[PDB]
User: Fold Ryanodine receptor 2 from Homo sapiens.
Amino acid sequence: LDARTVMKTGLESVKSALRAFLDNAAEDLEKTMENLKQGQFTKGVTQIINYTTVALLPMLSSLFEHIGQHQFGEDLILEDVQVSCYRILTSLYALGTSKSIYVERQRSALGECLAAFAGAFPVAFLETHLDKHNIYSIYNTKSSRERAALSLPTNVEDVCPNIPSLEKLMEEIVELAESGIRYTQMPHVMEVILPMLCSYMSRWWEHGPENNPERAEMCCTALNSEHMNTLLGNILKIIYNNLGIDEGAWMKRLAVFSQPIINKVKPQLLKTHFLPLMEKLKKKAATVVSEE
Amino acid sequence: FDGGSRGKGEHFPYEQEIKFFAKVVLPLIDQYFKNHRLYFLSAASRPL
Assistant:
């Protein structure tokens, strides 16, 4: 799929087709919300769940990962597509934070779908205090009266209440590295959040004022490269704990999801940060894990 | 077929038609898009 020229000049019914596909995938996710809330148990609604966990998560994952690869998040999703994908975000984060035994055996697909979603999204959904700086923001597009005419909560914190801000997420990350407790008692973060964290980090890394010095204090994302390095090091600490707790392959999938971050990290940053990582790995050499 | 899906009779004038579709055309679509990914992906951004 490529859709840039379709978005600029194309058939209106064709555009309506993609809008219908996207918001249908969103309402299906909403139905999964309602079903698992009424009962965590996962025959029509069961068939809907099967459709979801077999194709809908894969199709959306592929769609948004491809959108990110081709840099298409800035044209496809502007008007009410942001609303549908905010429903999608709330839904997928709800699965990623759910404690259901049923949601567990598709949690691996959940993690790769959440990262793919966060890998491509038109606005920085974790920069609420500076999301006004983005003109692409649905609030900026809808101004005030249209924002009211649409079922828009008028606050970005209000359209994403459940998912914490970037600051809350990163303070959670640092206290998690302080804790270093085992994956079973904390599954959620290192199964879904860290992948989507890294995807968001890559998505708005260039938007960080260190990367674009111009238009600072005006940047939508107040991203920091030292913050990036701290997130990576926190991942390293918790991954040493994972290697000590016999880990699984979910952490290998974490490593391959975070490979782009350890690619954007600098060579002077590579030294004295990964040589430690290889020496931790090689003192715990009895690991199937292949870092880098 | 939605009525026939939950019904007993799966016999249709288009039975062999949908069988040929699912067994040939859809795999044909898969392999064809796989072979010509770049042709579709080309959007005047200087690929191919």
Helices of chain B lie at 2-6, 15-35, 37-41. The longest helix of chain B spans residues 15-35. Chain B touches chain A through five residues (CB under 8 Å).
